[PDB]
């Protein structure tokens, strides 16, 4: 059984190929949509269902932390809520009122801001 290529829909006869996204590909049919590099071996990210390499992602495909306003590395974990996301860091995801870290705590969101408790939301008007 030769593995089938999910891009060009034909079999791979080379003895080298790439596995990504649960699928097989000719080396040259899994490539950064932005800079065209061969993704094989390398870290990549699915943005709008096209694979991009790590530096293209960092350079034009965002995810900017609501707390510190810096990009969140696509390799590390992050906290999301609705359209928002924060580094999983005591500096980014904490209480707007009292600074209490909220990673894995109960919290209360109000647009961007985020609080540990009703009390804390009730200060901050």
């Amino acid at each position: 059984e030769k593995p089938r290529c999910a891009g060009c829909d034909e079999l791979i006869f080379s003895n080298e190929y790439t596995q990504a996204e649960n699928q097989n590909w000719h080396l040259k049919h899994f490539c950064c949509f932005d800079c065209d590099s061969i993704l094989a071996g390398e870290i990549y990210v699915m943005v709008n269902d096209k694979p991009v390499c790590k530096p293209c992602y960092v350079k034009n495909h965002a995810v900017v932390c609501q707390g510190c306003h810096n990009a969140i590395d696509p390799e590390v974990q992050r906290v999301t809520y609705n359209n928002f996301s924060w580094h999983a860091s005591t500096e980014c995801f904490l209480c707007s009122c009292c600074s209490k870290c909220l990673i894995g705590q109960k919290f209360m969101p109000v647009e961007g801001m985020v609080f540990c408790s009703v009390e804390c939301k009730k200060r901050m008007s």
């Binding site: 071996g41 390398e42 870290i43 990210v45 390799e75």
Partner: peptide, 22 residues
Amino acid sequence: LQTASLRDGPAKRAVWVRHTSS
């Protein structure tokens, strides 16, 4: 009130399937 859930980064690795030489 709700709970903070760590989600994983969207990055993955493209596995380079290739045999080892003699």
